[PDB]
A paper describes a structure:
Rep binds at an origin of replication on the DNA (termed ori) and in most cases comprises a set of repetitive DNA elements (termed iterons), which are present within most BMMFs. Reps are composed of two winged-helix domains (termed WH1 and WH2) that are essentially a fused N- and C-terminal protein.
In this study, we determined the X-ray crystal structure of MSBI1.176 WH1 in the dimeric form to 1.53 Å resolution. The asymmetric unit consisted of one WH1 dimer, i.e. two protomers (termed A and B). However, residues 36–39 could not be fitted into the B protomer owing to a lack of discernible electron density, although the electron density was distinct in the other protomer. The WH1 structure comprised five α-helices (α1–α5) and five β-strands (β1–β5) in each protomer. The A and B protomers were closely related (r.m.s.d. of 0.37 Å); however, a minor structural shift was observed at the β2–β3 hairpin, suggesting some flexibility of this region. Similar to that from RepA, the MSBI1.176 WH1 was also folded as the replication-inert dimer, while RepE (a WH1–2 construct) was crystallized in the monomeric initiator form. Superposition of MSBI1.176 WH1 and RepA WH1 showed that these two domains were structurally similar (r.m.s.d. of 1.20 Å), with both having the typical five α-helices and five β-strands. The MSBI1.176 WH1 hydrophobic pocket also contained three leucine residues, i.e. Leu11, Leu18 and Ile25, which were similarly positioned as in RepA. However, loop movements and different α-helices and β-strands have been observed among the different structures. In the case of MSBI1.176, the β2–β3 hairpin shifted approximately 23 Å when compared with the RepA β2–β3 hairpin. In the MSBI1.176 WH1 structure, six basic residues were also found in this region, i.e. Lys69, Lys73 (both located on α4), Lys85 (β2), Arg90 (β3), Arg78 and Arg96 (both on adjacent loops). The function of the MSBI1.176 WH1 β2–β3 sheet orientation is not obvious, although MSBI1.176 WH1 has a three-amino-acid insertion in the β2 strand that extended the sheet.
Residue numbers in the entry:
A (entry chain A): 2 to 132
B (entry chain B): 4 to 35, 40 to 136
The structure:
Amino acid sequence: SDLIVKDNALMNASYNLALVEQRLILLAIIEARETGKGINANDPLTVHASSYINQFNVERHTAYQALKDACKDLFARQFSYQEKRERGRINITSRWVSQIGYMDDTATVEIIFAPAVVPLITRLEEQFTQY
Amino acid sequence: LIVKDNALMNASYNLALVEQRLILLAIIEAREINANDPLTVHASSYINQFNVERHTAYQALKDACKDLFARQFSYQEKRERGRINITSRWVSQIGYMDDTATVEIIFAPAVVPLITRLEEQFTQYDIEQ
């Protein structure tokens, strides 16, 4: 089925993300829930370096730069898969995120997930959660 | 501040003509637009509207899709506590269907609110055709 194919393609592509990129995504999910924001293809999601520090106990002075650099690395990625259309099958290429942003003065970044990824965000949360 | 409209319209000058026409055709066929739903462009529409070689027209659109997907533009916004530096794609997703000679794009959310301005600029450029 289509959703199984896309899920498979995204999960296989997920292995290429660096740990900081996985944590950027996890943090966006966590902060969205915490501040009462849904995840969709239009609205930016904020990530605070302070949350990165609080969630993962990472070196504090490099946390914001790590997130800033992870945004750029994630923004460069793409994945491909096929979907059904009325008139046949379509060959799709998608980004992970359509937009990124950073605010140096507040140590925050912003991302918008691409629409193909939005329905699989809970699968990514599962894929990326470490115990 | 690097205002978004200025940055995007200046970035539009950098597109190849086929990419500009891909965007215009997507807008046209839609009328005949949001950050979630793909927009279809038929190579037959490209051929019918523009003075292009018909035998290579679909391939030209496929290549234009890939080039447009590779592009980015940047701008700034004022926020409460300071300035944010934003980088956006033109399209978040592309697709092609060889058997029907069609392509698909989804515009990135930063571009959606400027689509009418892009339509006007690209219509003015190609008004003779």
